[PDB]
Amino acid sequence: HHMKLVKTPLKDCYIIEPTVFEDERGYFYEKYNEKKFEELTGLNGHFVQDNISKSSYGVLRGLHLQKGKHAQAKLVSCLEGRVWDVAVDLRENSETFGKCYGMELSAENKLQFYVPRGFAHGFVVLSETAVFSYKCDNFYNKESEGSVKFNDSDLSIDWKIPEADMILSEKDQNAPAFKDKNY
Amino acid sequence: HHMKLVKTPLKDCYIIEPTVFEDERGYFYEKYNEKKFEELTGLNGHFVQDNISKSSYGVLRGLHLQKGKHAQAKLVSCLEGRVWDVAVDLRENSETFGKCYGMELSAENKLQFYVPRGFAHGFVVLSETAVFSYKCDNFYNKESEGSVKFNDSDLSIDWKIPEADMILSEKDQNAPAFKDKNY
Numbered sequence: 001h002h003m004k005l006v007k008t009p010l011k012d013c014y015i016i017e018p019t020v021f022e023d024e025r026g027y028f029y030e031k032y033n034e035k036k037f038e039e040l041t042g043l044n045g046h047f048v049q050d051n052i053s054k055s056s057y058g059v060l061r062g063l064h065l066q067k068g069k070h071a072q073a074k075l076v077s078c079l080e081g082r083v084w085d086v087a088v089d090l091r092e093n094s095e096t097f098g099k100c101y102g103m104e105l106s107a108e109n110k111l112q113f114y115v116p117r118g119f120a121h122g123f124v125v126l127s128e129t130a131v132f133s134y135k136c137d138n139f140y141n142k143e144s145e146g147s148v149k150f151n152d153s154d155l156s157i158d159w160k161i162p163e164a165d166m167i168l169s170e171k172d173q174n175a176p177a178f179k180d181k182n183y
Numbered sequence: 184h185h186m187k188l189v190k191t192p193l194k195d196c197y198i199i200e201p202t203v204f205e206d207e208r209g210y211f212y213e214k215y216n217e218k219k220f221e222e223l224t225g226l227n228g229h230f231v232q233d234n235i236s237k238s239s240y241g242v243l244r245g246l247h248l249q250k251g252k253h254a255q256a257k258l259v260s261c262l263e264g265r266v267w268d269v270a271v272d273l274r275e276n277s278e279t280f281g282k283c284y285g286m287e288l289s290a291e292n293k294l295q296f297y298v299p300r301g302f303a304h305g306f307v308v309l310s311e312t313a314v315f316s317y318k319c320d321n322f323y324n325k326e327s328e329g330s331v332k333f334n335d336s337d338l339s340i341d342w343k344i345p346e347a348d349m350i351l352s353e354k355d356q357n358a359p360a361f362k363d364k365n366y
């Protein structure tokens with residue numbers, strides 16, 4: 001019954017590990033519960049928007065964020081296939097400012113990854129195709145968008161797959177460096 | 184960009200039709216947006232709990248509800264496979280009291296079904312297995328639970344699959360009739 005939030009090296013960034021109940025017909029679990037989450041973290045647990053994408057192997061999207069009062073906390077998971085998901089703490093006041101953390105999200109492992117406001121976020125598709133789910137605690141605002149180049153040499157993120165396999169949009173190919181502070 | 188809610192014969196009960204953008208690598212869509220939903224319906228759009236179940240062909244769960252102040256509106260969809268989903272309006276003051284509506288929810292069709300508070304809900308798995316997602320706008324409360332027998336003769340619900348294929352829990356096999364008012 002208790003929600004299980006697992007610590008990561010980034011402050012306020014958590015893995016939600018599900019408690020899965022199995023039985024004859026299959027399984028069931030409580031994927032998310034706002035009251036439990038807010039009780040455990042003291043953070044906002046009210047999500048207002050749910051987004052879905054399906055992409056093919058090697059598609060890499062990120063690192064993305066919305067600035068200021070438009071910043072979005074994200075609760076992300078993989079509904080089909082496998083992805084490698086990365087978060088970067090960009091809060092200048094945070095003891096983990098400038099640090100990154102990555103993890104595999106898959107339909108099989110049923111994990112969710114909570115990325116606070118003030119972070120940048122991205123992911124790469126590891127399987128033939130993957131369906132990616134992200135819930136946001138704030139609404140879309142194009143003008144507020146910020147970004148960090150995914151392969152910025154200061155962050156030195158390990159995106160796991162061969163570089164020749166990565167598929168990037170023109171925007172993500174041209175995102176400003178971490179030191180340029182487009183956030 | 185506009186959310187598309189499609190009317191059903193039951194008052195306040197809607198189908199959410201997604202606006203799916205296809206591209207080279209796949210697709211993306213906004214599955215849910217609380218602000219758009221509340222603007223269109225005048226109803227509460229703040230969901231607080233997300234639940235997942237996976238079940239095998241013929242598993243039928245329902246008809247279920249929570250009574251009184253614990254009643255849960257449900258936004259339901261099928262993430263893998265195919266289900267037949269049914270809602271019953273049980274609000275005594277409603278012009279559609281006692282009426283039912285069923286529809287197929289599948290991973291392929293990406294539809295969502297909004298079941299208001301004061302309704303009972305259930306579904307049966309049509310494919311070999313199915314993964315069912317339901318978001319609730321209120322929290323679980325065991326004591327508040329109500330139920331209606333899925334094959335109640337006054338409601339005469341068409342559950343699509345052969346009765347011999349249906350797999351029901353002991354509780355659902357013994358749910359009180361619609362006219363006994365366990366709600």
Ligand SMILES: [Ca+2]
Pocket residue numbers: 034038044045046
């Ligand atoms: Ca709250």
